[PDB]
Structure formats: structure tokens, C-alpha cells
Design an enzyme around this catalytic site. Structure first.
Site, mmCIF file in Angstrom:
data_model
loop_
_atom_site.group_PDB
_atom_site.id
_atom_site.type_symbol
_atom_site.label_atom_id
_atom_site.label_comp_id
_atom_site.label_asym_id
_atom_site.label_seq_id
_atom_site.Cartn_x
_atom_site.Cartn_y
_atom_site.Cartn_z
ATOM 1 N N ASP A 207 0.835 -1.201 0.000
ATOM 2 C CA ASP A 207 0.000 0.000 0.000
ATOM 3 C C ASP A 207 0.865 1.245 0.000
ATOM 4 O O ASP A 207 1.837 1.314 0.750
ATOM 5 C CB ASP A 207 -0.932 0.043 1.221
ATOM 6 C CG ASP A 207 -1.832 1.261 1.208
ATOM 7 O OD1 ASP A 207 -2.794 1.281 0.408
ATOM 8 O OD2 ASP A 207 -1.549 2.218 1.970
ATOM 9 N N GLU B 187 1.785 0.025 -5.044
ATOM 10 C CA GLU B 187 1.376 1.335 -5.535
ATOM 11 C C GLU B 187 2.574 2.261 -5.589
ATOM 12 O O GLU B 187 3.003 2.796 -4.560
ATOM 13 C CB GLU B 187 0.333 1.964 -4.609
ATOM 14 C CG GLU B 187 -0.987 1.219 -4.520
ATOM 15 C CD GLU B 187 -2.037 2.028 -3.796
ATOM 16 O OE1 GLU B 187 -1.978 2.102 -2.550
ATOM 17 O OE2 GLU B 187 -2.915 2.598 -4.469
#
Ligand SMILES: OC[C@H]1O[C@H](O[C@H]2[C@H](O)[C@@H](O)[C@@H](O[C@H]3[C@H](O)[C@@H](O)[C@@H](O[C@H]4[C@H](O)[C@@H](O)[C@@H](O)O[C@@H]4CO)O[C@@H]3CO)O[C@@H]2CO)[C@H](O)[C@@H](O)[C@@H]1O
Ligand SMILES: OC[C@H]1O[C@H](O[C@H]2[C@H](O)[C@@H](O)[C@@H](O[C@H]3[C@H](O)[C@@H](O)[C@@H](O[C@H]4[C@H](O)[C@@H](O)[C@H](O)O[C@@H]4CO)O[C@@H]3CO)O[C@@H]2CO)[C@H](O)[C@@H](O)[C@@H]1O
Ligand SMILES: OC[C@H]1O[C@H](O[C@H]2[C@H](O)[C@@H](O)[C@@H](O[C@H]3[C@H](O)[C@@H](O)[C@@H](O)O[C@@H]3CO)O[C@@H]2CO)[C@H](O)[C@@H](O)[C@@H]1O
Ligand code: NA
Ligand code: NA
Ligand code: NA
Ligand code: NA
Ligand code: NA
EC number: 3.2.1.41
Length: 981
Positions: free
Chosen positions: A616, A645
Site C-alpha cells: 500500500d 502502488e
């Protein structure tokens, strides 16, 4: 009232961002008593806002010594309407601030444009013959006979005052304070002129007595002042004379023994704090950390890193009633700032077997005591954040003494993953443990409690049939904002805020599993057994498991600040922890934070035998930490893969830049891949411009840009390896693929023809993704057309502004008319099971939902197709440039530069020729083959308008072979294969 109070703060509002004040609220954080929770409706509503001459105001309780108040205005919708705002409390009694109609923040009431208010305070309270003589960029300069200036007659909050009409674009004015009771020169209170230089920025100035300084706030603090000291001083803006210390970089606003110092510039005095870097020199510890349960439960070895502590004890709570304290055991100092202790048969706790007992760390610093959670805890007491205000013990979870190895299926090991050899070979499927079995349609079918690790096992055959290699699980590590004791309650009403459901992006601990997906959160051991079981069952079906992990931030700064202050997080100059949603931004460049991440990765690999991780907000980290983690993970499981990400979000420590682990990092490593927003945005839209027509949704795009993305060469970061690219069009974030297509083409899915069209476009997109180079990623339910439409019966048509669901878009057709049930959730992190359920009937029941199951079989075919040849998953850029060739080349055979069609060819290693043709247009479109591609007429057809797979279709549908080549029906893609064999 509250203005006669040390700890209230009044926020004033010029104009509310939106029309309806009932739908708006003031959201606060930082140094307030009760930071707002429950986005968005926990905000203080403007419904009851009192009103003054300026506008609305609201009062906020503080928690002294309060320095920093942060706030915004939100709505029921709940957008952040103003953007984040922040006020610094200049002095103890600064208890008011003002937001102007441009949402700029002032420490005084802003005056209308074309006016500067001049405030003059006199300690002696005598204004009798006091006046102002002025000139400059003003309408009416003093013109009367000297020393007849403008009288100070009006009394305000900060002395008397005068309103001076300004000229347009006023910049400079000069003035004299006068006392007309004197004579000659003595009428000037100060003999020398005042000049104010900054009328563009300030509409009030503040003067007192015979002070030379022109102040810009009513608290008479100067513009240049100190804000921190270390061990180099933080300044507000930009000396030898006024600085002192006991026991000059202006662009960065900075000025430059093993114990605290004391620094002062004029009146502001600061206690020195240690740099994290110094801390690292002296206390960097590399030995084991945590609570290791040995001798068959009869012994526990404890180690906690806490350099600044005076004393440390472990508080032990009862295995059967975690509220009951059994006792305490002092820890003793160890090497490198650690504290250690062995709990054994020698204990004075009346304990024989420590297994299942709970614990926290009582930490004493400077005569103050806190209760802290062991960062290395391996399981936890059942957790309910709704009880966090009961006492210090309830503020963070209680850890458990457990032994994972002994628990669960003992045969557990790394997956042997079908059709998988390298990262290009993986097909990632992103599911939330609860969503996957929360559909009430399957309630009578399940043998395990719904929404749990073990219920998940009962639907793994669907995924094996689908053909995916890797099941990526949304956060299973412990998260904060959740009541685990209510995990078996069905969240059946539609709601998009204030739900017990959580995606899990509120991290509490990096070693323990959440109790939320457990059959019994009160048993600290069951969740470990259950999870090892799920992982084992995944492996036994030839699949791998990838863990979404959220190291970039914790849920609460205290989680790590109470362990060791001003170290673990990224921080400002002054050493203030940098924050995100009220929690800490963990600084993975700091030695012990770095080893937290790596130890966690290593621990979860070894313990749960998982096959990879998804980071994340990975761009929040330094690249080195992530690469180290990758190495460490692989040394345990050589087939392990990572992705993240890689948005460009690095913040880090103030004034310390570092190569971040973002999309730009890809040109320097062939390890951890990143999500490609370029492909996502080009095919269908994306955050922050959801619904913009795009390649599969009626919006022509640059044909070369599409092709590049399809060969894993996104145009927004350099990918020197196709494995660098995670190819996707949908994920847990943002609208579902089905939902965004409907939004984008402005066609209401409740007309059956529209439903059909959306599914055609959905298959198209999925085809393009599953035949693209790199690593395909599939959002769970992307295969069947999953929806997050808000179908509360009171929400059939648009509702009042104060009833709008959190994180929804209102979808409209071509005439601007709301769809039936027009609200669709685009951020379902805090939505109920009605929004978040994987729809099992739509996914599997072909008679009830032909169209949905047709799309699901299409996906399954595309995955088999992709698996049948390495043509779509080539292992190097160079080979891709050898083997993949654009047929529809812009500027040739009348191929337009931008379009909604594309065709290309792959020559596979074994000499087979594959071709991909996509017609996303609303009419039949023709692909000119020429002489160069005439051989494609010999092809078997592997995908048509109805189906896909590795075996030739006998009666292909939606194709017509022509003089020029091949003509596809509207909203049709095809995959062709010619084998000279
Ligand atoms: O609280 C903030 C918001 O949190 C959630 O937003 C998510 C998005 O939904 C995700 O899509 C992602 O956003 C990425 C985005 O996908 C990526 O393309 C990139 O976008 C940049 C873009 O590259 C750049 O050119 C320019 O246009 O700025 C864009 C940023 O707006 O980067 C994004 C990350 O910054 O992650 C965010 C953050 O978690 C949530 O859905 C929202 O409701 C919420 O307001
Ligand atoms: O309380 C102080 C903060 O207030 C405001 O923050 C609010 C957001 O503006 C609002 O959108 C919402 O945020 C939630 C996200 O919408 C939701 O997606 C999720 O975000 C996750 C994210 O998905 C994940 O990738 C990231 O790493 O973790 C995020 C946090 O868990 O949850 C969000 C948090 O609930 O609500 C916020 C208030 O809680 C200000 O905008 C913010 O700056 C303040 O810090
Ligand atoms: O715009 C023309 C003019 O503006 C400014 O003159 C100001 C003076 O600088 C300021 O001191 C004050 O002058 C007064 C004297 O202080 C006082 O002793 C007595 O002589 O009366 C004077 C005013 O008549 O105010 C004037 C503005 O009126 C600027 O500084 C000048 O250079 C310029 O000529
Ligand atoms: Na100032
Ligand atoms: Na049930
Ligand atoms: Na970009
Ligand atoms: Na989807
Ligand atoms: Na192969």
C-alpha cells in the site's frame, strides 16, 4: 463564554463551500480534545453554527499545551471541500481564527478588499488625542493641517482602530502615530516614519504604545521567530546577538554531549531533542525482538527496544479474562537500548503455561507512564476500538503469548503454483476476506462462519476453476477501527460510512493477524490456525497468496510514539511526527523502522508460507527498504513476488530527500512491480477523472499510446522490463469496472440493452488486459461485472444534500438524468456488506444471469488462453520489440492517429503467430491486413464476441473476412492463432 476559556478555539467561516449548511461540517484533528472520527458525519455540523457579522463560527475544545489545530469543511458526500487547513496557536491565548472566501487562514477578522484596518493598542488606555497621519496607496491621504490626523475613536478587540480606504492593487503605505496633546515634534509618538510593505497579504495591522514594529497578528509576535532545536533551528522565516544556549539557510528557513540542551532566540525557549540518526548510532539493535514462547509454553523470552525508558515492565493479563491484570514483571536493561526478561517457572504470577496469556508494556519516562503494544506481537486479544476510551489499557490492543509453528496444518509450505515460472506469468486476483463470502445468498450454503478465513476456503474452487495463480488478500494484519466482537453480525443495510466493515488500511500491528476474519477473536491462537489453513488450501489448489501490507502509516501516532518518542516516524525539523489520517508516517529509513518492515516480511513469509506482498502506498517508502525486503523474502521463498502502488508520494523526513520506491524506481530494479495507471486511464478512466470517455468507453485515444501500454511500455514511467508493469483496469479503490463503464458511456444498466452493451465493453477491456505483456491483475468481481451501486430503497432517485451517501458519484445518462438508483460508491472502505459483497448468484448462476456468467466464462477463457502460450507473457523488452508488431499503424492505410480500434501481432517463440484485434467502436470496423499480414486469414479464432480460450471456435461470431482483411462487429475483440504446424 468560551472566549473566557483556556481551551476553546473559535473557527470563523466567511462562506460555506456549498449551498446547504445542513450538509456540511467542520472536521478537526491535531491538538483538539476529541479529534473528529467517523468520516464524514462525525464532523461538527454547521446546522447549529452560530453566526456573527462576519459569518458562521464553531467552537472546538482543546487538549494545554495546544499548539496546532487542523481542520477542513466536509459534506455528507463527504468530500473534503476546503482542502486541509491548519492553524498554529501563536501564544497561549490565541483562541480564534478566520477562513476567508478563498479558504485562507488569518489570526484576525479579514477586512473587505480595498481596506486596511489600523489597530493601535495603548497600555495606558489613553486615546484622548491619538490620531493617525497617513499616506501612500490609499484613497484619502492626510490632507488637513498638520498635525490634524484621523482620530482613533472606534474601540475594537486589539486597541482602538481606524479603517482606511485603499486604492486598487494597494501595496505600500506610510504612517505616523500622533498625540495631538503634545506640541511640535513631540506630537509624533515615534519620530521616524512607519512604512507597511505588505498590503497585498494583510488587511489588518497591529500597533502598540511606541513600539517600532508593525505587527501582522493581534498577539504582537514578530515575523522572524524560532520554532525548534536539534541536535540547527527551525524558523518561521528569515541573529548572533539574540541567540543563547546552556544546559543560516534562509531558503530552507533554518539556522545552524549525550544529554538535552536549551536554546533561545529572544523570548522563545526550546528543549533540544535527539536526531533519529544519532539515536541510530548508539542504539541500532539487530538481535531478536518480541515475545518468544519456549519450553512448551513454560518460558517466554522478552525483548523490547526502548532506549529512552527509565523503567519497563510487562503487564500480564489473564488468558480467560483479558480485563483482569495478573501482575507485573520488571524488565532489565540489555544491549543497545533494549529491555529483556525471561518469564519461566520462577514467576510470581501463579502461571505454569504462558500460552494464551496477554500482555502490554508499561513504560516509564521522566516520571510518566504509558501502556504500549509490543510491535512484535504474534497475536492479540479480541479488539474493539469502540472501547478505546475506557482506560489506558484499552487504548491499544493487548498482545498474546503464542507459538505459531505448532498451530494449523503442519504440512504447510510454499505454493507450487500452476503456470507460473516468473513474475510475467502471474495472474493476480484481488479479494477482501469478508467480501468473498458475505453474500447472504450463500448463507445456507456455508459450513463456516461467513466472512472468515475458513469460510473463504469453501469458495476457493471457483478461483481454481477461474485459473488465477495468485490471490491477493486485502490487509489481514491487525487494524484499528473495528469491533471484532461483532464480526459475525451481517451488515445488510446499504451504508457507505459508519460501518463495522473496514478494508483494513488502519494498521495497529505488523506481526499479528486481525481478529475480524476469525471464528473466534477471543482465542488468540485460532486466527493463526485458521489463516494457515486458508493458505494451505490455496496452495493445495495450485495457487499462491499475496498479502496487501500497509507499512506506510499506522492508525495512531501513539502506537509507535509510546514505544520510543520522536524516532520511528518521519518527522518535521522540530521532530514532530509526520502524520496521515491521525496516524504516524513510519520512516523506513530509520534503522529500527526499516527492520520492522523487513522482520515483518520475513516473519510472515516463514510463518504463513505466503507467496508475495502488495505494498500500500509504496511510494511513501525509500527504495532501499523495499529492495532489502524483497531480497530477505526471496532468500526464504525463491519464487516469491512483490508489487506495489508506486504513486509519486514520498514525503520522508523534512529536508532529507531519498530515492523513493515509486514508478520511477522501475528503471533501476527488476524486483518489485508497480500498478500502471497509464493503461488503466487510457482504456477506461481513472482517479481523479473518473468517467471521462476513454478507449473502451467511446473516447478515442492515441493508437501508439495504447500499443505501448499493451506491450508493457507505459508512457508515464520507464519500464525496462515487462515484469515491472502490473496491468490493470480495476482494483478495490475507485469505481468497479462495470460501474465506471456505465458512468463513462452514460448508459443506465437497468435498461437490458445497456446492460448488454456494458458487458461487451467489459469483455473488451478484460481481453485487452489478459493479452497484454507484463503481469495482469484482476479485481475480484471484475470477471462477472461486480457493482457497488447504492440500492437503498429510499435512494431510487436523487436525495437531499444532507442524505447523500459518503463517497458516491451520482451517475447520469446522456440527457443528464439520474440513472435509476443513481448513487454508486467509488470508495467502499467504510461500506456495509450490501455494498461490498461478492455477488455469488451473478458470478455462477447462468440461468438467472446469462450475461454476467457469460462475462465470467470469458475471463476464464482469457486466462486459459494466456496460459496456453508464452506469446502474451514475454520475458524481456528486447524480445517484445522483436516479436510484437502493430498492424494498425497511425498514418498508414488511413489509420487515424487517435481511435477506438487497434490490431497487432505476436510471433511466439515456437513460431506460432497470434493476433489481437479490438473494435471498441459502435459500428463495424475494418482492419487492413495488406500483404504483410495476409497469413492471419489462415488462423484459428481463439476469442470472439461470445467466448474465449486456447481451443479454436468452430463458428466464430462477430467476424467477417474481407478483401482488405478483417471486419469486426461493433464492440468486438478477437484473438487469432496461426500455427505453421
Ligand atoms: O484520502 C484521499 C483519497 O484516498 C483515496 O484515493 C486513492 C485513489 O482512489 C487511488 O486511485 C490512488 O490514487 C492514485 C492514482 O491512481 C494515480 O493515478 C496517481 O494519480 C495522480 C496522477 O498520476 C497525476 O498525474 C495527477 O493527476 O495527480 C494524481 C493524484 O490525484 O496517484 C494517486 C495517488 O496520489 O490512491 C489514492 C490515495 O489513497 C480515495 O479513493 C479517495 O476517495 C480519497 O479522497
Ligand atoms: O482525521 C484527519 C484527516 O482528515 C481528513 O481525512 C479524511 C479524508 O479526506 C477522507 O477521504 C477519508 O479518508 C479515507 C479514504 O477515503 C479511504 O480510501 C481510506 O484511505 C486509506 C487508503 O485507501 C490507503 O491506501 C491509505 O494508505 O490509507 C488510507 C487511510 O486508512 O480511509 C481514509 C481514512 O478514513 O476520511 C479521512 C478522515 O479519517 C484529511 O483529508 C486528512 O489529511 C487528515 O489527516
Ligand atoms: O506623497 C508625497 C509625500 O509623501 C510622504 O510625506 C510624508 C512624510 O514623510 C511624513 O513625515 C509626514 O510629514 C509630516 C512631518 O512628519 C511633520 O513633521 C510635518 O512637517 O508635517 C508633515 C506633513 O505635512 O507625512 C507626509 C505625508 O503628508 C513622503 O515621505 C514624501 O517624501 C512625499 O513628499
Ligand atoms: Na507573522
Ligand atoms: Na448466518
Ligand atoms: Na504521470
Ligand atoms: Na471490478
Ligand atoms: Na512457459
Amino acid at each position: 463564554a468560551h472566549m473566557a476559556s483556556d481551551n476553546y478555539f473559535r473557527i470563523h467561516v466567511k462562506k460555506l463551500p456549498e449551498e446547504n449548511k445542513d450538509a456540511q461540517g467542520l472536521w478537526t484533528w491535531d491538538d483538539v480534545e476529541k479529534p473528529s472520527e467517523n468520516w464524514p458525519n462525525g464532523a461538527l455540523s454547521f446546522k447549529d453554527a452560530k453566526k456573527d457579522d462576519y459569518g458562521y463560527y464553531l467552537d472546538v475544545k482543546l487538549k494545554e499545551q495546544a499548539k496546532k489545530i487542523s481542520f477542513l469543511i466536509n459534506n455528507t458526500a463527504g468530500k473534503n471541500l476546503t482542502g486541509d487547513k491548519s492553524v498554529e496557536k501563536l501564544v497561549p491565548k490565541m483562541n480564534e481564527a478566520w477562513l476567508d472566501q478563498d479558504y485562507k487562514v488569518f489570526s484576525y477578522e479579514p477586512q473587505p478588499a480595498g481596506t486596511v484596518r489600523v489597530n493601535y493598542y495603548r497600555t495606558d488606555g489613553n486615546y484622548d488625542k491619538k490620531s493617525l497621519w497617513y499616506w501612500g496607496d490609499v484613497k484619502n491621504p492626510s490632507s488637513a493641517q498638520w498635525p490634524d490626523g484621523t482620530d482613533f475613536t472606534a474601540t475594537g478587540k486589539y486597541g482602538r482602530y481606524i479603517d482606511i480606504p485603499l486604492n486598487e492593487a494597494a501595496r505600500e503605505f506610510g504612517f505616523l502615530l500622533l498625540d495631538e496633546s503634545k506640541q511640535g515634534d513631540d506630537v509624533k509618538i515615534r519620530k521616524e516614519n512607519y512604512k507597511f510593505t505588505d498590503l497585498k497579504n494583510h488587511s489588518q495591522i497591529f500597533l502598540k504604545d511606541d513600539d517600532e514594529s508593525i505587527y501582522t497578528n493581534p498577539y504582537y509576535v514578530h515575523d522572524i521567530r524560532m520554532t525548534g532545536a536539534q541536535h540547527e533551528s527551525s524558523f518561521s522565516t528569515l541573529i548572533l546577538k539574540h541567540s543563547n544556549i546552556t544546559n543560516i539557510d534562509e531558503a530552507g528557513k533554518k539556522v545552524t554531549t549525550k544529554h538535552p540542551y536549551t536554546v533561545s532566540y529572544n523570548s522563545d525557549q526550546f528543549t533540544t531533542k535527539t536526531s533519529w540518526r544519532l539515536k541510530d548510532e548508539t542504539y541500532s539493535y539487530d538481535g531478536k525482538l518480541g515475545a518468544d514462547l519456549k519450553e512448551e509454553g513454560k518460558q517466554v523470552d522478552l525483548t523490547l527496544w526502548s532506549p529512552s525508558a527509565d523503567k519497563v515492565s510487562v503487564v500480564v493479563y489473564d488468558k480467560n479474562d483479558p480485563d483482569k491484570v495478573v501482575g507485573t514483571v520488571a524488565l532489565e536493561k540489555g544491549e543497545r537500548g533494549t529491555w529483556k526478561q525471561t518469564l519461566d517457572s520462577t514467576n510470581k504470577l501463579g502461571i505454569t503455561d504462558f500460552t494464551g496469556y496477554y500482555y502490554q508494556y508499561q513504560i516509564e519516562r521522566q516520571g510518566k507512564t504509558v501502556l504500549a503494544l509490543d510491535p512484535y506481537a504474534k497475536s492479540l486479544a479480541a479488539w474493539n476500538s469502540d472501547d478505546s476510551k475506557i482506560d489506558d489499557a484499552h487504548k491499544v490492543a493487548k498482545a498474546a503469548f503464542v507459538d505459531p509453528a505448532k498451530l494449523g496444518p503442519q504440512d504447510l509450505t510454499y505454493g507450487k503454483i500452476h503456470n507460473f515460472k516468473t513474475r510475467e506469468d502471474a495472474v493476480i486476483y484481488e479479494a477482501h476476506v469478508r467480501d468473498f463470502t458475505s453474500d447472504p445468498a450463500i448463507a445456507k450454503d456455508l459450513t463456516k462462519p461467513f466472512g472468515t478465513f475458513e469460510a473463504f476456503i469453501e469458495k476457493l474452487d471457483y478461483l481454481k476453476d477461474l485459473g488465477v495463480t495468485h490471490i491477493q488478500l486485502l490487509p489481514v494484519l491487525s487494524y484499528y477501527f473495528v469491533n471484532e466482537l461483532k464480526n459475525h453480525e451481517r451488515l445488510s443495510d446499504y451504508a457507505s460510512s459508519n460501518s463495522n466493515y473496514n478494508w483494513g488500511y488502519d494498521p495497529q500491528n505488523y506481526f499479528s493477524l486481525t481478529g475480524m476474519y476469525s471464528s473466534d477473536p477471543k482465542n488468540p491462537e485460532k486466527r493463526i490456525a485458521e489463516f494457515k489453513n486458508l493458505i494451505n488450501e490455496i496452495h493445495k489448489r495450485g495457487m499462491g497468496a499475496i498479502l496487501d501490507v500497509v507499512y506506510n502509516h499506522t492508525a495512531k501516532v501513539d502506537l509507535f510514539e509510546d514505544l520510543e518518542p520522536n524516532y520511528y516516524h518521519f518527522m518535521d525539523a522540530d521532530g514532530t511526527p509526520r502524520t496521515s489520517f491521525g496516524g504516524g508516517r513510519l520512516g523506513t529509513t530509520h534503522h529500527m523502522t526499516k527492520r520492522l518492515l523487513i522482520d515483518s516480511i520475513k516473519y510472515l513469509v516463514d510463518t504463513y508460507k505466503v507467496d508475495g506482498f502488495r505494498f500500500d502506498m509504496m511510494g511513501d517508502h525509500d527504495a532501499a527498504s523495499i529492495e532489502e525486503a524483497y531480497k530477505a523474502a526471496r532468500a526464504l521463498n525463491p519464487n516469491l513476488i512483490m508489487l506495489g502502488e508506486g504513486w509519486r508520494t514520498y514525503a520522508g523526513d523534512e529536508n532529507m530527500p531519498t530515492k523513493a520506491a515509486d514508478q520511477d524506481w522501475m528503471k533501476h530494479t527488476d524486483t518489485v512491480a508497480v500498478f500502471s495507471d497509464d493503461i488503466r486511464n487510457n482504456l477506461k478512466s481513472g482517479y481523479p477523472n473518473e468517467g471521462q470517455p476513454a478507449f473502451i468507453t467511446g473516447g478515442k485515444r492515441d493508437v501508439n499510446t495504447i500499443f505501448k501500454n499493451l506491450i508493457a511500455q507505459p508512457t508515464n514511467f520507464e519500464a525496462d522490463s515487462p515484469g515491472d508493469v502490473i496491468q490493470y483496469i480495476a482494483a478495490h479503490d475507485n469505481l468497479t469496472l462495470f460501474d465506471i463503464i456505465a458512468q463513462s458511456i452514460k448508459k443506465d444498466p437497468s435498461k437490458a440493452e445497456n446492460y448488454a452493451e456494458i458487458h461487451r465493453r467489459l469483455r473488451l477491456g478484460n481481453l485487452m488486459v489478459l493479452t497484454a505483456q507484463g503481469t495482469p491483475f484482476i479485481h475480484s468481481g471484475q470477471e462477472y461485472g461486480r457493482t457497488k451501486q447504492f440500492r437503498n430503497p429510499a435512494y431510487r432517485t436523487p436525495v437531499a444534500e444532507d442524505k447523500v451517501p459518503n463517497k458516491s458519484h451520482l451517475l447520469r445518462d446522456k440527457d443528464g438524468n439520474p440513472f435509476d438508483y443513481p448513487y454508486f460508491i467509488h470508495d467502499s472502505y467504510d461500506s456495509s456488506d450490501a455494498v461490498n459483497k461478492f455477488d455469488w448468484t451473478k458470478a455462477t448462476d447462468g440461468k438467472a444471469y446469462p450475461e454476467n456468467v457469460k462475462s465470467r466464462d470469458y475471463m476464464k477463457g482469457l486466462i486459459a488462453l494466456r496460459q496456453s502460450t508464452d506469446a502474451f507473457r514475454l520475458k524481456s523488452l528486447q524480445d517484445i520489440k522483436d516479436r510484437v508488431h502493430l498492424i494498425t499503424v497511425p498514418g498508414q492505410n488511413g489509420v487515424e492517429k487517435e481511435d477506438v480500434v487497434i490490431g497487432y501481432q505476436i510471433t511466439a517463440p515456437n513460431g506460432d503467430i497470434y493476433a489481437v484485434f479490438v473494435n471498441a467502436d459502435e459500428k463495424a470496423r475494418e482492419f487492413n491486413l495488406g500483404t504483410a499480414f495476409a497469413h492471419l486469414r489462415n488462423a484459428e479464432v481463439l476469442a470472439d464476441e461470445n467466448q474465449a480460450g486456447p481451443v479454436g471456435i468452430a463458428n466464430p461470431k462477430g467476424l467477417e473476412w474481407t478483401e482488405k482483411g478483417l471486419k469486426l462487429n461493433a464492440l468486438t475483440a478477437t484473438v487469432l492463432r496461426v500455427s505453421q504446424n
